[PDB]
Amino acid sequence: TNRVIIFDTTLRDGEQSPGAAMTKEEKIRVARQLEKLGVDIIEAGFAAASPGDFEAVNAIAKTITKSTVCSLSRAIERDIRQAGEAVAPAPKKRIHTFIATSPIHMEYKLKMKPKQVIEAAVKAVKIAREYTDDVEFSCEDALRSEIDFLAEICGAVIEAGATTINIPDTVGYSIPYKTEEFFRELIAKTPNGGKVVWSAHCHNDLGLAVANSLAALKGGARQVECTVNGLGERAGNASVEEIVMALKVRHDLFGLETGIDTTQIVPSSKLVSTITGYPVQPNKAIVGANAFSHETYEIMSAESVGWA
Amino acid sequence: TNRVIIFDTTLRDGEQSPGAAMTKEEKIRVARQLEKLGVDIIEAGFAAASPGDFEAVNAIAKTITKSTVCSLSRAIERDIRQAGEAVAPAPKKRIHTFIATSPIHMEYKLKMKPKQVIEAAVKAVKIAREYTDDVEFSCEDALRSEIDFLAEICGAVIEAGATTINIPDTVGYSIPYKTEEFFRELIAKTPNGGKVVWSAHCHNDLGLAVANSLAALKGGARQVECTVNGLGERAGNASVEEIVMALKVRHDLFGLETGIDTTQIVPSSKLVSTITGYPVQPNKAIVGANAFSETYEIMSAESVGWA
Ligand SMILES: [Mg+2]
Numbered sequence A: 001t002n003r004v005i006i007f008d009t010t011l012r013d014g015e016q017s018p019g020a021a022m023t024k025e026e027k028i029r030v031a032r033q034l035e036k037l038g039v040d041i042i043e044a045g046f047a048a049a050s051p052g053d054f055e056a057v058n059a060i061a062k063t064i065t066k067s068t069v070c071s072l073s074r075a076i077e078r079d080i081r082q083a084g085e086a087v088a089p090a091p092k093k094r095i096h097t098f099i100a101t102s103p104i105h106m107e108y109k110l111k112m113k114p115k116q117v118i119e120a121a122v123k124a125v126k127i128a129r130e131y132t133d134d135v136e137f138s139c140e141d142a143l144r145s146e147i148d149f150l151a152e153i154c155g156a157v158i159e160a161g162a163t164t165i166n167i168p169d170t171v172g173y174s175i176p177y178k179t180e181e182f183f184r185e186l187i188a189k190t191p192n193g194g195k196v197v198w199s200a201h202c203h204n205d206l207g208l209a210v211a212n213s214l215a216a217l218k219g220g221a222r223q224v225e226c227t228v229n230g231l232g233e234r235a236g237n238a239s240v241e242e243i244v245m246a247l248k249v250r251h252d253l254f255g256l257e258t259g260i261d262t263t264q265i266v267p268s269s270k271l272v273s274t275i276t277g278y279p280v281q282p283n284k285a286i287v288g289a290n291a292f293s294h295e296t297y298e299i300m301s302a303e304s305v306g307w308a
Numbered sequence B: 001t002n003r004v005i006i007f008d009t010t011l012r013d014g015e016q017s018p019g020a021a022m023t024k025e026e027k028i029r030v031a032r033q034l035e036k037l038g039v040d041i042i043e044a045g046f047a048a049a050s051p052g053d054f055e056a057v058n059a060i061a062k063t064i065t066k067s068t069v070c071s072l073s074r075a076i077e078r079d080i081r082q083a084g085e086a087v088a089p090a091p092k093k094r095i096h097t098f099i100a101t102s103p104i105h106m107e108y109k110l111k112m113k114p115k116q117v118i119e120a121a122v123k124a125v126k127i128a129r130e131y132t133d134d135v136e137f138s139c140e141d142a143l144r145s146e147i148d149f150l151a152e153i154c155g156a157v158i159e160a161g162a163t164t165i166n167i168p169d170t171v172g173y174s175i176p177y178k179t180e181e182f183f184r185e186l187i188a189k190t191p192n193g194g195k196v197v198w199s200a201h202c203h204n205d206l207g208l209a210v211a212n213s214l215a216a217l218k219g220g221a222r223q224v225e226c227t228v229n230g231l232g233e234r235a236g237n238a239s240v241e242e243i244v245m246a247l248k249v250r251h252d253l254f255g256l257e258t259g260i261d262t263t264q265i266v267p268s269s270k271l272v273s274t275i276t277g278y279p280v281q282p283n284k285a286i287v288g289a290n291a292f293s294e295t296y297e298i299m300s301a302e303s304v305g306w307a
């Protein structure tokens, strides 16, 4: 379809930003607001990381109704079961597992051979399916990985039961036309790649996270991972408000739909910025104090994104 | 040519952001830092706007020697002569003049027939050449203009003496693949198009200013208009530091060069931020506080000027 899945990881990937740690009650209040915003998936945390993380994921899984509650997990049985237990009380639940897939990370960081990396991923996915029909797998460091190896592991995890395959720009140096080509080629090479949802998780190190996200869509991805205000380590993630509004404003070029209530964009941005201490600069798209200072496209009004 | 021209308009387009007006002393100091950074053109102001603006532009023109000093002008005789008088002292000097080229702006704002609009542009560009051989013409509202009219007016001002033609995304809703197509088509359609430098001036209203600028270069543009920290009205301009470091890091894909000293990027960011009161967020590419917490060139913090 033309439906783009918005996967928000403000509460997991965003909260990892220096100084951005949140209390359990702050996470719950942010999770409630993301639900009102209409994001499809709320990644609530990494249940196996500590008792506090488990408790926050679990509390969000007990709060949310209309969005899918996700937990991160390493590709290891015990972490998967932690994830599955934490999200069990949510009516819609996802487990997101990952493993590094690039030659150097595999050999010298994980110290596993490619055969072992595929076997661990398949096993993690199969265990995850005991807990939910909705399982995401990420190829960490995808863009420095061998394309043949990516097609093979993605193929294996699709067969094992993964229904969303996520490709991060781990380093953050990709350029949109290359991102688009990379998606088109990987989807084509992966056994049964047409049968699942492809996801992009882009980084803003060269100011291109949003452009690269949109390029991933043109290449065949239908999920974008992103955060309110682009909150995230280093230069940050793709910012959900920019993605959603590029798609809304230029529906004429993309023809893609989201479930987002755009009137909740500004309240979401303010709430996130207040809680985390990360200010939003004045010239920032959509939610910057100046963005509304002042054809087949749909021009945007300040009110349409929730300015008072 | 694989040289990209970095046109900085922090002191003009940037200055126009609410609250960001700068005194002459502030402008001189930013301008010296922009010269150190190695930008090719410093658009210093709009000389005809007031005597204070004339003085500031002229002060910059007496300061800067290694970069081109530019003034904005409307497409009218008074403004062009004042731009030309104010930049006269600089060894490298440019006048940038402009007119709206869209059906709506021409009919409703200008109240001129397209023919009169061309004639006014041609007249402004000829007078500009009395003052310098280096003249930029912008088609204001280019992306809502009829491409055949753009080709005609651009052909006419090139004949008149414009050597840089600038295409702004005035509304700011362009998408990279469309920006690339648009430049490729316009350059090829314009008479003597190959004789001049084509420029992009992109806006960040959808978060896409930098990507649109890179797309313009893929499309044949060789000048990018940009500002320190993306300073400008609304959601701002393409950020000079992002454009320059995207080109540097991914030189493997672009093969394009600038004369920028990248070690000057963070000093320039901090200075502009201090003087304008426009902070940069922690998660801001290159210059944000957290930014630094294979055929490509990995960026070190020290390479962009972090202490
Ligand atoms: Mg906190």
Ligand SMILES: [Mg+2]
Pocket: B019, B020, B021, B022, B274, B275, B276, B277
């Ligand atoms: Mg000031």
Ligand SMILES: [Mn+2]
Pocket: A013, A201, A202, A203, A232, A236, A237
């Ligand atoms: Mn991230």
Ligand SMILES: [Mn+2]
Pocket: B013, B201, B202, B203, B232, B236, B237
């Ligand atoms: Mn501008």
